[PDB]
Symmetry: none
Amino acid sequence: MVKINFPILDEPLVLSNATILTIEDVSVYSSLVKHFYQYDVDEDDKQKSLKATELMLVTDILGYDVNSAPILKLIHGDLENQFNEKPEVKSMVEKLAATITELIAFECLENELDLEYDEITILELIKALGVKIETQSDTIFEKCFEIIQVYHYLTKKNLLVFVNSGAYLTKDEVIKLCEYINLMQKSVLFLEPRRLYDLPQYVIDKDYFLI
Amino acid sequence: MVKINFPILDEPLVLSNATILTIEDVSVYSSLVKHFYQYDVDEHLKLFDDKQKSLKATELMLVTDILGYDVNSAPILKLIHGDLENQFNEKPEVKSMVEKLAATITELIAFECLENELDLEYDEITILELIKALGVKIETQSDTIFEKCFEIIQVYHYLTKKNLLVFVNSGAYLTKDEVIKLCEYINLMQKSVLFLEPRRLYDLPQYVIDKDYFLIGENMVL
Amino acid sequence: MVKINFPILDEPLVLSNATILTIEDVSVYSSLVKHFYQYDVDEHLKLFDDKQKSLKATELMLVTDILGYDVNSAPILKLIHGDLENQFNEKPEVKSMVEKLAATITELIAFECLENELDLEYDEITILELIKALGVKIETQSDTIFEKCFEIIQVYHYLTKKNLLVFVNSGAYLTKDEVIKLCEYINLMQKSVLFLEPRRLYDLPQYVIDKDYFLIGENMVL
Amino acid sequence: MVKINFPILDEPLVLSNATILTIEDVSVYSSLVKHFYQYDVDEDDKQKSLKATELMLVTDILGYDVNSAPILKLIHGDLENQFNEKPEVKSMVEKLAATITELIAFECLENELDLEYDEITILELIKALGVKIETQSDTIFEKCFEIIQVYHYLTKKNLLVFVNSGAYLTKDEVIKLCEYINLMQKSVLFLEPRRLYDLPQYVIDKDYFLI
Ligand SMILES: [Ca+2]
Ligand SMILES: [Ca+2]
Ligand SMILES: [Ca+2]
Ligand SMILES: [Ca+2]
Ligand SMILES: [Ca+2]
Ligand SMILES: [Ca+2]
Ligand SMILES: [Ca+2]
Ligand SMILES: [Ca+2]
Ligand SMILES: [Ca+2]
Ligand SMILES: [Ca+2]
């Protein structure tokens, strides 16, 4: 359930599900952002520190790559699972693939070479279709949603941090993100330089006090 | 037919179907093998006909390591998959059938994409992608060196750009009955194959350049 | 100078040297940031001048993740190393000197190659290879977000193909004195830089589009 | 010091330094060649079997790649060592590199960018020179020699096997190879289908007897 601590903070802060952390001091805010990008060099999970690779750090939302080969692999596997949950439709795809197979098989036999082959699987069909996340038309909200949905897939990630993203989002959008995150039950941090609407959030004051 | 010439030969030698050329002198044998591997920078080594026209270096297929020869290399697979696509292109009715089936599959996967919580897009499933997904490749059930040779000859017949296959020093791996079977198989596929040997290959019909550099026509009809 | 226009503006806005543009409405701010990232497919978003001529998409340099910005990317390094080679090409005396030294080194390594028991060959040591071997790269001693910004502006000045740099939502990382220092540094390098902000950046001279979409000239001379 | 055993062989045969193994039966010869290429699937060093990666197997001599990145690395390192053994000449190279460095340094300072750099090392000079084994003009003997010389570098290889190479080599050439191998003290096997001149060699007869 991951907790955060630094010199300014007297007691470690619990980051469960969706958390907004607002730091009103510019120099402390900029410093913490810097330290996130440098994690870990300077200074629940039973006292266990998170590996650098467990961190998912986002400032440039639109530029963030949600279509990496590891992510595509998980999406295609998830889609294969959807077919597995529908035996009716899975059989349809298989029947279609078997017809295709025999058409290619006939051409293989006509070819002068002694040719062999394996099979066309549902997963191979999904991959060949080039299924990917649409990002071209993304609003910043839409891309934030896609990033969180990807974080849901990544088991080796246990903290997603949006740096200074609040400025792009309406109150209703922040709520919608948070509600999805709460349902997901993985830790997300919105690290903000000023109050994000009137939403529940941890505020470190200009006098370094926690609210 | 392909013709071979080099200084030691008095005249060019015709290489039609399966030919065995035996060189009994180690130095001359070794030099000829070297010149084949250098073709055509050497010459000395001449390969022609194409009526009087030299074979391009690209037309030569040299095999010394029989088991190491990769019948399903990336370039060979690319050729096979492209040729199979062309076979569909030449058959409009069946091409249309494959395309129809791929589109029905696409519509089914598209539905699952919309059901999925992510905003998903995709391209298309092509005939080439289907051929590739099926894992089409040349059958390779050969265990022995003898068996492997047939697969190599099959590749040679497939490659229209090749006009001479040379097995270098392969006789040592093969029984007499095996060489006969290979030569019979070679005869069926029409293209020139040379077995280049350092010693006489049993008592089979063969050209022999002996220790005094005479060309002898061994078990050959007078 | 570069000019920016979009429907909410009554007339184009001149972006000369350092400019702060503040948009107090979340939706309009978010939409403008999106349109910058989509430039030029959107438009709506207009960027021109080049006297009346639209900036090409390639002329825009957008920075939101300051610390993530890679100042020594492979493309940037390739440009730097090529430019340094060109600097030698423009100086025949020094080019000749480098070539002479490389040839003396070559003759020394060549001797060791002949002493070595392997039959060794080689090509040549080029000026470009020497530049690359030396590990020439932009100095990056920045620790803070503020310090990193100077390195980004330096890259922007270097890239002649870029004609607008936009820092998106960067004001939140910087003190007032820091923004002033950045703007003073930007002024020295002549090219247009836009700080695109969702809230007023201290009391610095800035253009503000307020909640009712009025354009206000904040701490600006009347 | 590696030993060889198979069904036909009643006792394991010691393969020390250069060894010629002649098998007069065509079917046994072809079979053993096949098994070498399949090692290990079918059936000194204290009873320890060699890994497949310890094997260096050569039939197509001229086609064999002696200029792989791992080999080039070792050659360039060996050449750097030759300079290290000659402090006089090493200093000459360094002095020349330092002059080059300052010429580039001046251009770096003239350039509008604030540029830094490291150093030009002897090893980097050798690599930039593109030092490699010449193979284009190779006779088969010359390439055999190069292959053995490369085997000398490869510490993770402990048996080099030339399959049916004798046919290409004169007696004096086989001697020259063997003498280098004996000096090297790594195991090399010449696997031959008939006697290789009158040189000392292990012969398995047409009646399967060892001489
Ligand atoms: Ca067939
Ligand atoms: Ca398959
Ligand atoms: Ca596709
Ligand atoms: Ca989208
Ligand atoms: Ca969907
Ligand atoms: Ca040498
Ligand atoms: Ca400089
Ligand atoms: Ca260096
Ligand atoms: Ca070079
Ligand atoms: Ca050589």
